[PDB]
Amino acid sequence: DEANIETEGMVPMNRLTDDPRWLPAMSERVTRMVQRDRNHPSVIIWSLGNESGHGANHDALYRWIKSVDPSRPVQYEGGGADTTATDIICPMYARVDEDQPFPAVPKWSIKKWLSLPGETRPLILCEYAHAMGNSLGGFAKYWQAFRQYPRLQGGFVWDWVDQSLIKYDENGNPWSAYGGDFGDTPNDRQFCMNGLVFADRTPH
Amino acid sequence: RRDWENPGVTQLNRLAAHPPFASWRNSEEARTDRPSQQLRSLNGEWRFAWFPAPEAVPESWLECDLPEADTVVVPSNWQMHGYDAPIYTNVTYPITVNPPFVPTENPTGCYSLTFNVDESWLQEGQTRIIFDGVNSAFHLWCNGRWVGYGQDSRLPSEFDLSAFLRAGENRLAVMVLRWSDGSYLEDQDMWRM
Amino acid sequence: RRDWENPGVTQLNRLAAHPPFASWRNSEEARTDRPSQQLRSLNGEWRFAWFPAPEAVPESWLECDLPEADTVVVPSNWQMHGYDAPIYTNVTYPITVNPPFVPTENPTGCYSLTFNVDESWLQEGQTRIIFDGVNSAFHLWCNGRWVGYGQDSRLPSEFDLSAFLRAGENRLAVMVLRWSDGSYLEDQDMWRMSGIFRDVSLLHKPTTQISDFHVATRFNDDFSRAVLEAEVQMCGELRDYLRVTVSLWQGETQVASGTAPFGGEIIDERGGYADRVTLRLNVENPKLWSAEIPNLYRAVVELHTADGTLIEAEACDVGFREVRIENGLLLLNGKPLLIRGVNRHEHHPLHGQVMDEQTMVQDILLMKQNNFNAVRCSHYPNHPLWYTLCDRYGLYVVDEANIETEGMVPMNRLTDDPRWLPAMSERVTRMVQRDRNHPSVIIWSLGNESGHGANHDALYRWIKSVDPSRPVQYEGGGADTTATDIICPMYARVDEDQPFPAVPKWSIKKWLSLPGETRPLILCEYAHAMGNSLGGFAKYWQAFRQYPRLQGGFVWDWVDQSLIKYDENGNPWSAYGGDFGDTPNDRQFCMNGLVFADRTPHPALTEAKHQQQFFQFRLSGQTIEVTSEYLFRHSDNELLHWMVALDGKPLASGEVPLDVAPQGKQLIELPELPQPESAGQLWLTVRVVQPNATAWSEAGHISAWQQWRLAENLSVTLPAASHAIPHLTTSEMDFCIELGNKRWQFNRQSGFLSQMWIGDKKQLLTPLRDQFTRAPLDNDIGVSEATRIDPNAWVERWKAAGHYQAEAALLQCTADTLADAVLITTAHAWQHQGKTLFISRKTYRIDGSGQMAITVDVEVASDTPHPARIGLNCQLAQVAERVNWLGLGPQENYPDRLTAACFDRWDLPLSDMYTPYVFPSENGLRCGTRELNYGPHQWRGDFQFNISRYSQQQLMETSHRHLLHAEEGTWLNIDGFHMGIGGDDSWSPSVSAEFQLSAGRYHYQLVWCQK
Ligand SMILES: OC[C@H]1O[C@@H](O)[C@H](O)[C@@H](O)[C@H]1O
Ligand SMILES: OC[C@H]1O[C@@H](O)[C@H](O)[C@@H](O)[C@H]1O
Ligand SMILES: OC[C@H]1O[C@@H](O)[C@H](O)[C@@H](O)[C@H]1O
Ligand SMILES: [Mg+2]
Ligand SMILES: [Mg+2]
Ligand SMILES: [Mg+2]
Ligand SMILES: [Mg+2]
Ligand SMILES: [Mg+2]
Ligand code: NA
């Protein structure tokens, strides 16, 4: 269960989440989610949101959930996937054997990540295997690794269904449309279609 | 007094969040998770009118239905009804990055509903309304009188209407703003509706 | 649209909090911390009008001054101006508890000010206004137009007036609401006031400005090297030609300096802060900061262009110090501290809660002079100047957020409610952003008495993320919750547990070793100094010194919160709860200081100074061993001063310079001390003296002292029998002994000495009778009131038992003649409703030398609350100017608070034998007295005493010290035994067992005579 908080557009990504002036707005998107869904057994982990760097607000809210509900682990990939605001190393798109040494927020090979000096948490990718179009190549490698490494406990494929919308031509026939197809601009082409199934739930 | 441009105001008169309620008046119904008489759905056909900004919303609307309005189904996204286009942007915000300000031209959706309340609901207890999802912020009026405000498109906003409702016909006025300071926290890579 | 009744709205258009700014336009002015042209003060005479509610404020006011208004000084509290009464309530909220709603009748103060702005301020840059303190919420208008709103009475609210001001005359309209939803978080046990009580300023900043800067100092393991890290953030137009240069100054010297363009390091996938830059300067062998030696540097932040043009400069004092809790201990620069602290409310007897430099410096000097090294901002951020002073004078500070809700039920009803997370958040975060650069601030506190809710944990973690340099603490919820790095109880006793459910107060010694516990323990409040208190104080320190992890505490508290009123004649007097028509009120519970509102020391302050000494001494024959308790300084401004005296009579003395390294020891070999001859007790007395004057001390200031009973010579040569012999005359109603000039009369109907004569001069105005009660001390009363009685309080236990109204029944009264003296034998039985409470057997022996030897032997029922005292008393007829005695003094001292007192010959004016506690009670006692001299009289033995013009009765019937009237003659209370005063807290029996008159059978002997 993930709070409604993404500010990936800001620069740096945590410009709001680290600003105490925004602690209130964020607070309510975390606390109200917990107070609402905390009784569902299917909810096993709480997430503080998505792509919003790592600000103090995240740490504050992290600790809140831990105080309010000890029954569930909290996780957050912002700021490098292994920040003090997450109980699980939850990177997104970190490869199996290859490192991607980005400054500040690198994506280590998931196998190398688990054994980094001092690290001890379990690692579950919050997003991996971008299924955009003819994709999912190398998927078997992830699982090979998941099964061999005790602390490599899986992940969440990205993602389920294509975010395509239905439009109609002059004849009144339906067709799948994406970025820009509605006069929307600026738009991000077809990047809204990353599913394992088409908008109409037909398997890829 | 623009509330959609102040991250300090995320709600006004909204009740506290909580687990799913149904207020059964019979334990057997509760155990079997059967429908509840105390939980009515206001889904269906509502009255809708699109505007270029909240400042274009005619006062009359608060008390009297606009004839220029259309009857549409709720819940729904007005983009899907063709009132304006749905935008698809990944990272780059759909609006200009200048927190906590949003465009002066803020697509405002005016939803209204005439429905009646059983007299027994007003003779006792509390009668509240629950909006499970309003994108991205909105103001609520019940019978011309103002009730409250709410933000956060993905969690329910609840308000106590007990003192606004009357037995019989009642009318809801819901001014929904497409953009708001809350949009700064809603930058997910999906269609922006 | 009521904003004062919505905890979701705590401000409107208020600018971001930040370290103190001045916007210097000259780097030299910044470095030298000289006044700034860009920082004007709007303090002075303003226009004020009071209203019953905001709804009564006439619109005209927004644009036109009300003629009905008055001209008053700002800052100030309108209660202090008499516009309405200041309320004094402890826990119970001053308003009705119904969050977030406040009374419809909300006292609204309307402040206005006409002032003009230089045209140059409006031609460029930003012009903002700064309200350092508005109690408790307010709306601001500039020239009729509305600007913003603000809450939180203890932190500054800033608004950008740039677009509201015009060149020339301008007018400010400030509507201040006394009550608001914010009042729910401001329930501290102090006078409840309101208004603009802190400075109002006008700051001009360039458009492209410095909007914030954080100073950090990290060292290597031995503090030989240190790296100063300065993160700077800007606003306005970003340009490459922009630069920031942070330079560190040690006096006129420039130890280091760094320059760099904006553009921080990459922090995440989106890059970094292009509007920030961090400078890192190296510092070799830095001068470390401490309360011992407040070594400071000057950090100057300059916003300029690459071509060298200064845009603006900001600065602050920097103190290189490292605070960290390691292995269970709180370390300051690697050494484990011993907090000799005190809690200090911002209170002025005439100005209400308005602070000024003078009052501050005064308090600071007094504190340091009485060996204090730390202070707790109970219970809200203090006036900005305070931190600056503590920085320079040297004081460890606990900066505490403005959050107390002790009135709620349960105490954490709000702090655990996520709906209130926002309001709380701002009272914590804004404090940190403001004071985080002050080196004197060593610990952050989350507030006071507000239970333990999730909000506390959330905010706890925030500070830890934002500022790793300081430990966070909070006593709420049991003092050892997950929201505190330090076990910080309040009033937890030394050896005795107080097993309260949920939130017990364990013996501080037992607390440290509780299974799993490992943190350091520092009481945030202990030794409630209310009235005649601080008994058992020495026990705390004994323990602090023995236990590594018992690192001190903060006494409660500094100054009495009494206000000055005037009677018909126009004379000033100290007033407290209720004295202003305020009700409900909490009596005198606002007076818990070590000093009176006017900073005059209480007797207890002296005890504190002594127990908190930084030099410990031990004696072994001829050698005195001095151990230093300092962690950094050397005793480079001290010399030991010793002196031997036989029962007051000095014999030898001298002085050795002190050369002790911190933590070190020094041995001092006294010369072959003078060999006494006469009978008596030799007393070695050492005093540490500061020859040179400091910034806080006069020259020759005394920082410590200690006494030792050297040798003793019991007198064996009993008196030379005079040939005269007393004559006994006998009536049926009296026994009269005459000897030369003197005449003694014992009323055979009472069994007490009813009168004595020295010529045709009477000596007593009231018979010499036994006494087992005392004018109840605040600690004896606790929270027991007229209507609400606390059956547990000592005063009630006594009352119920009947001690205050015991009829003295005579059992025997005989007289016999001896070979050289008359002998009167008495025996009384004090009872109440049949129950025999006390029995007092005595024998008076008047001999040829004309000396009366009174021998008392009392019995106390082993099932009647232990008596407050066991002695005698009578109203003498004389009224002398001085009092001389050989015993513990010079100041007031009681059994459980007499360590600081010294044994010697003391002489003082009758008045100094009376302690002016605002709330009258037993006082002025002096223990361990072998000789007392008053007028023609002299009493000898081994007793305690208090002598004044007020009877115990008057004292216990009078509520204020100003309603006390001198009585005929002088009342003498001579105790053979006196119960301790206690004080571990003032709301429950707090007198240690060893100080309770429980022996059952007591015995003392006195010798009355004419000197
Ligand atoms: O479709 C590309 C994806 O990239 C991820 O980093 C992001 O978290 C997803 O929400 C989506 O934007
Ligand atoms: O003397 C009563 C004291 O009790 C303390 O618990 C409180 O923190 C103080 O502010 C004061 O109310
Ligand atoms: O602060 C702790 C205690 O302080 C006392 O003054 C008060 O009477 C008690 O009820 C409790 O509040
Ligand atoms: Mg808003
Ligand atoms: Mg994204
Ligand atoms: Mg408010
Ligand atoms: Mg209190
Ligand atoms: Mg001692
Ligand atoms: Na997508």
Ligand code: NA
């Ligand atoms: Na210690």
Ligand code: NA
């Ligand atoms: Na008090």
Ligand code: NA
């Ligand atoms: Na010296």
